[PDB]
Design a protein around this ligand. Structure first.
Ligand SMILES: CC(O)[C@H](O)[C@@H](O)COP(=O)(O)O
Ligand SMILES: CC(O)[C@H](O)[C@@H](O)COP(=O)(O)O
Ligand SMILES: [Mg+2]
Ligand SMILES: [Mg+2]
Lengths: 214, 215
């Protein structure tokens, strides 16, 4: 259907996250427990947010690097719907996380932050991974790296390989038309919703512009 | 200089970790807050362990993939000595974590878990990274991957580039002779200490073996 809207809670404490969710939880489709929040509070963040918003998809952005079955199980036992595994993880890490996800009727996303290869991407596909997150790194953004046509070419290629593609990384309202034409599964916004003068209006403008374009 | 011993606390809760540390905190050199414990409890795990063992090096094995400044600052504000950054991270992630670490007189290790390249490795050195963790993935080990020739070659080349190398990934006592003659900085043991009948005796065994092999 239309691309979904995910909010990233990149906060260090639950009470800080709740300053955002109390405004916009009903305005988005997916609530992400950001990596920062996973490190700040641990898996209780996932458990708490799913208890609050059980009708929403909750994503634990754990960026699992290894110990796929152990870490995925902690997240899913805390009631996560989706978990992320980082792109450089050994293929057996992705496979282990996916096996656990199936036990809980969840799913795994590969987080494409940093270095990866097209040969690894075929591997994830062969392993049964259906979701990837195309991510312009925060630190790369801060060093002046922009979105460009090489990103759009890569998103299209991933989509043609059969992945559902999430797009993220300092996304602004004005960036949405760059992706016009592509069956994007999810757009993530963290800062552009959380730090907006009006987070509710920020979220609604995202949803309005997605409905315009798709 | 003898390889040091690091215990990995890959427990899901602090009380489980303390079942280990009450036994071996004084038998090891470095206490690692494992990724599993960081995800289970959050960075309070680092703060609490450092408060218990302030004379020991405490390593937060956060395996930072992005947001280097923010995640490293969280670990260091919790009184970590060392933090880890995963090999695939953008170079600016490592630089950002290293800048923070210097403010707190700490350090950063690159974690070689999964795929990375030798051009990647030079960038780490230029950037001022002085430590790497040569890691045999747990999931790879479970799928039959053993310690081998290519591993030894890679570790020697890393060391010659000027990195202090930590070795880890399912290490058992019988694995240590494979590394003899290489100036390994640290060996990490998790399961082979925590899950032993006597964690104290397992740690002492590692220490005796090391003292024989490198002495
Ligand atoms: C980097 C990361 O994982 C963040 O959650 C990111 O996906 C979305 O947040 P930003 O929109 O603030 O870049
Ligand atoms: C995988 C990881 O980070 C672990 O802490 C590892 O380095 C040491 O633990 P094991 O000796 O149980 O393989
Ligand atoms: Mg995130
Ligand atoms: Mg570890």
């Amino acid at each position: 259907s239309l691309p979904m809207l995910q909010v990233a809670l990149d906060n260090q404490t639950m009470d800080s996250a709740y300053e955002t969710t109390r405004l916009i939880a009903e305005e988005v489709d997916i609530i992400e427990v950001g990596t920062i929040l996973c490190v700040g509070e641990g898996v209780r963040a996932v458990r708490d947010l799913k208890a609050l918003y059980p009708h929403k998809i909750v994503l634990a952005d754990a960026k699992i690097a290894d110990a796929g079955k152990i870490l995925s199980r902690m997240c899913f036992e805390a009631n996560a719907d989706w978990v992320t595994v980082i792109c450089c993880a050994d293929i057996n890490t992705a496979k282990g996380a996916l096996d656990v996800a199936k036990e809980f009727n969840g799913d795994v996303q590969i987080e494409l932050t940093g270095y990866w290869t097209w040969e690894q991407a075929q591997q994830w596909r062969d392993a049964g991974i259906g979701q990837v997150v195309y991510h312009r790194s925060r630190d790369a953004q801060a060093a002046g790296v922009a979105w460009g046509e090489a990103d759009i070419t890569a998103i299209k290629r991933l989509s043609d390989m059969g992945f559902k593609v999430t797009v993220t990384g300092g996304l602004a309202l004005e960036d949405l038309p760059l992706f016009k034409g592509i069956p994007i599964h999810v757009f993530i916004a963290g800062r552009s919703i959380r730090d907006a003068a009006s987070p509710v209006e920020a979220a609604r403008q995202f949803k309005r512009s997605i409905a315009e374009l798709w």
